[PDB]
Amino acid sequence: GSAPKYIEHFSKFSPSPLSMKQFLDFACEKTSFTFLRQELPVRLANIMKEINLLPDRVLSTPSVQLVQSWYVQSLLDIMEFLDKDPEDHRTLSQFTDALVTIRNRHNDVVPTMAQGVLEYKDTYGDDPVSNQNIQYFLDRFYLSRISIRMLINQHTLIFDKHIGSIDPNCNVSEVVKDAYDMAKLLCDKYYMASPDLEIQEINAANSKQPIHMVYVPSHLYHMLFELFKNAMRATVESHESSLILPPIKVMVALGEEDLSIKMSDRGGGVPLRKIERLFSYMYSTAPGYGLPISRLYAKYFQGDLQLFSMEGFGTDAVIYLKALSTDSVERLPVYNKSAWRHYQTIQEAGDWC
Amino acid sequence: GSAPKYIEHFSKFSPSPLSMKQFLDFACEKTSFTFLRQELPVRLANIMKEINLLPDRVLSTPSVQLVQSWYVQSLLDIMEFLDKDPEDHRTLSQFTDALVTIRNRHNDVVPTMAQGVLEYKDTYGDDPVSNQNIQYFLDRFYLSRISIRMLINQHTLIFDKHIGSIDPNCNVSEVVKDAYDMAKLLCDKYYMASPDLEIQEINAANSKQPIHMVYVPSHLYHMLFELFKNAMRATVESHESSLILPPIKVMVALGEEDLSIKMSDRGGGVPLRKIERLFSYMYSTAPGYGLPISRLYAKYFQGDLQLFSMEGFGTDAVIYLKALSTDSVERLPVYNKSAWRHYQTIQEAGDWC
Numbered sequence: 001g002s003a004p005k006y007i008e009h010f011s012k013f014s015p016s017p018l019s020m021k022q023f024l025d026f027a028c029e030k031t032s033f034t035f036l037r038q039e040l041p042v043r044l045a046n047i048m049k050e051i052n053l054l055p056d057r058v059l060s061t062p063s064v065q066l067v068q069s070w071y072v073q074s075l076l077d078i079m080e081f082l083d084k085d086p087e088d089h090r091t092l093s094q095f096t097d098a099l100v101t102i103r104n105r106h107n108d109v110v111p112t113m114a115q116g117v118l119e120y121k122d123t124y125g126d127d128p129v130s131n132q133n134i135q136y137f138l139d140r141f142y143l144s145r146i147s148i149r150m151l152i153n154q155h156t157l158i159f160d161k162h163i164g165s166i167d168p169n170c171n172v173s174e175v176v177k178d179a180y181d182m183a184k185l186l187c188d189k190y191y192m193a194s195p196d197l198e199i200q201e202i203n204a205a206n207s208k209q210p211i212h213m214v215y216v217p218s219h220l221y222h223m224l225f226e227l228f229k230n231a232m233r234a235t236v237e238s239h240e241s242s243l244i245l246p247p248i249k250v251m252v253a254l255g256e257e258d259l260s261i262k263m264s265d266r267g268g269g270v271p272l273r274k275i276e277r278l279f280s281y282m283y284s285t286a287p288g289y290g291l292p293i294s295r296l297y298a299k300y301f302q303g304d305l306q307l308f309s310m311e312g313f314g315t316d317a318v319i320y321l322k323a324l325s326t327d328s329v330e331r332l333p334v335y336n337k338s339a340w341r342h343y344q345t346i347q348e349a350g351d352w353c
Numbered sequence: 354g355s356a357p358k359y360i361e362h363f364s365k366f367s368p369s370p371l372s373m374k375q376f377l378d379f380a381c382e383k384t385s386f387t388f389l390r391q392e393l394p395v396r397l398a399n400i401m402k403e404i405n406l407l408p409d410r411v412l413s414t415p416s417v418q419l420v421q422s423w424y425v426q427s428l429l430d431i432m433e434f435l436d437k438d439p440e441d442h443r444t445l446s447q448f449t450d451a452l453v454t455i456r457n458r459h460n461d462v463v464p465t466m467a468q469g470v471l472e473y474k475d476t477y478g479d480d481p482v483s484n485q486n487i488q489y490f491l492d493r494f495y496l497s498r499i500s501i502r503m504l505i506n507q508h509t510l511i512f513d514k515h516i517g518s519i520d521p522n523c524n525v526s527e528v529v530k531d532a533y534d535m536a537k538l539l540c541d542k543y544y545m546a547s548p549d550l551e552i553q554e555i556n557a558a559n560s561k562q563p564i565h566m567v568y569v570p571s572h573l574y575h576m577l578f579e580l581f582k583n584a585m586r587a588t589v590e591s592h593e594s595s596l597i598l599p600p601i602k603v604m605v606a607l608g609e610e611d612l613s614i615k616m617s618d619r620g621g622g623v624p625l626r627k628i629e630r631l632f633s634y635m636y637s638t639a640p641g642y643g644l645p646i647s648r649l650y651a652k653y654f655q656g657d658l659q660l661f662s663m664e665g666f667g668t669d670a671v672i673y674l675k676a677l678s679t680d681s682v683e684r685l686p687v688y689n690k691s692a693w694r695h696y697q698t699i700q701e702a703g704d705w706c
């Protein structure tokens with residue numbers, strides 16, 4: 001009966017952002033164990049501390065409370081090891097199992113939270129301020145989750161060429177082809193027609209050396225797969241009375257600090273006003289969250305994911321990643337007096353008419 | 354000695370947004386005279402009322418006060434006519450001259466305000482919060498000015514095919530070629546080399562009917578010219594040891610509600626982190642404001658102007674305009690309790706680490 005106490009304790013610390021290189025220079029799981037014992041609790045606490053401070057209207061929903069209880073359990077699940085001592089080749093395996101169990105306990109957090117979004121929509125309505133607060137909270141909540149899962153996957157995978165989930169020689173174009181192949185398969189099964197792929201690389205400094213980077217391939221895959229699914233759906237549906245089916249074109253450009261991936265489709269495009277709503281959790285909920293969450297994966301390592309189409313023609317989706325492992329530093333949301341006032345939105349009659 | 358009184362009076366009214374169609378359905382300058390007598394004062398007052406409420410540090414600078422005094426004079430310049438009666442074919446020409454004089458009195462507002470930005474930079478420094486407030490204020494101030502100048506140009510031009518500054522049959526591609534030709538001329542004189550132009554139209558609903566729209570051609574020209582100047586400079590400089598000089602490609606797409614213009618160059622591109630700073634008034638000041646202000650012209654009629662490049666390859670600049678004159682409604686900034694708290698930025702340690 002001390003959960004509120006632990007949260008208040010660890011909620012005083014700030015999560016420690018790690019860089020893609022520090023992750024790579026990994027080497028004693030003892031070193032990791034002692035680190036994760038304090039970091040995971042700090043991260044769980046910060047996200048939990050922010051949740052506890054949102055409207056009781058949102059707190060009281062089975063959804064929020066359900067996951068809120070998962071975190072509480074996960075926090076307690078790791079406490080056990082605070083007084084434990086490594087050296088004991090079984091004290092640290094008790095941990096690896098403890099993590100693999102925590103990870104699975106949280107596997108359905110996205111759908112579960114999405115359910116609360118739908119509950120909110122029908123219970124209180126879908127207005128800008130509601131959208132804003134949810135957007136603000138879900139972006140942070142989810143990003144936070146991504147960072148926690150990263151640490152866990154790094155530990156579990158490392159202590160069962162690649163260092164955990166990180167590929168130091170990630171061939172971007174290869175991940176591009178993979179996500180395409182998978183989307184194509186689905187596209188063919190549902191529409192029995194699918195556009196082709198064209199890839200072009202632009203290695204600025206080294207004209208034809210294949211483009212490689214240090215990155216988490218499964219994160220990149222998730223982003224590309226989501227974008228390919230949308231570009232295919234739109235290309236196919238917008239040419240349902242055309243016989244020609246333009247291909248989806250991808251350019252992978254590597255500059256001094258940016259590694260950019262552009263995906264261009266001729267799927268008809270979308271009006272500027274609807275684009276703004278494609279990344280909204282609330283407006284994109286019914287009666288998925290591929291886009292808003294894919295973006296969080298981009299931002300997690302200081303990158304981004306942006307969209308811009310031409311209604312009547314097509315859409316460009318660009319994923320911006322940092323080219324250097326040095327610049328790829330975890331982007332973590334933290335609980336401060338700063339994050340507190342973003343929930344004090346009392347909007348009613350704006351500054352523009 | 355009543356300037357403060359007038360401002361407080363008219364500052365109680367909200368400016369009245371007009372649509373591109375109402376501007377087109379114009380027809381008695383008497384009707385205009387009586388309208389502008391109240392609207393101009395209301396608009397001058399709202400922008401003046403917001404200025405008076407910014408740090409005295411900014412208020413006391415010769416720049417701000419200098420323009421602040423221009424508005425005061427312009428406000429008083431129009432008061433005269435409040436009790437005047439039309440019918441008198443000379444009572445309303447006293448007005449047209451009164452406007453043509455007010456317009457010229459304000460011709461150098463941009464450079465003058467820019468001077469205050471530089472003053473600020475060296476006097477107090479260039480930090481995020483300073484940038485934010487200036488950005489917030491200058492965007493509104495300038496937009497406000499654009500709307501005032503619009504009314505004035507509409508009146509003066511109408512009462513000396515086109516209705517004032519509005520072309521009901523604006524051929525976009527033609528304005529594209531014009532701004533290109535002019536930028537090319539300058540580009541040739543300075544670099545003695547200039548890229549070519551390729552234009553492609555995508556009239557979704559009508560495959561090959563030339564793309565026309567109702568718009569203010571000189572506004573569109575200003576935006577395109579700025580973009581062409583940047584795309585030329587970058588293309589030329591990035592290929593200074595190449596002999597090939599890729600062309601600048603423009604696509605004009607017309608959809609059900611959007612009329613989009615994309616300008617693609619292969620000028621090397623810019624790192625994502627510097628893009629964010631290209632639209633900043635503060636960071637783009639030394640020791641011009643083409644971009645940030647071009648964007649305001651786009652937004653003025655509910656459109657937008659966005660940038661996205663690929664470091665190491667090139668940049669796409671897109672101008673989004675509303676396709677329907679019905680949707681082209683003046684976007685006006687207004688003074689409310691809402692606009693007040695955007696200047697209460699007390700940032701110090703954010704929500705992210």
Ligand SMILES: CCN(c1ccccc1)S(=O)(=O)c1ccc(NC(=O)[C@@](C)(O)C(F)(F)F)c(C)c1
Pocket residue numbers: 016018022023024026031032033035036150151152154155158164
């Ligand atoms: C934060 C401490 N670091 C630091 C930072 C700045 C200066 C000096 C030192 S560190 O580079 O020594 C470091 C890096 C990765 C991990 N851990 C891992 O790689 C994993 C796999 O255990 C996990 F899960 F944490 F990601 C651990 C335990 C420590």
Ligand SMILES: CCN(c1ccccc1)S(=O)(=O)c1ccc(NC(=O)[C@@](C)(O)C(F)(F)F)c(C)c1
Pocket residue numbers: 369371375376377379384385386388389503504505507508511517
């Ligand atoms: C705002 C009033 N309008 C309205 C709106 C909604 C419902 C009913 C009526 S209106 O359409 O009658 C109208 C439109 C343009 C102008 N003026 C002009 O076109 C100009 C040239 O005088 C100027 F400068 F104002 F732009 C004027 C005086 C009035």
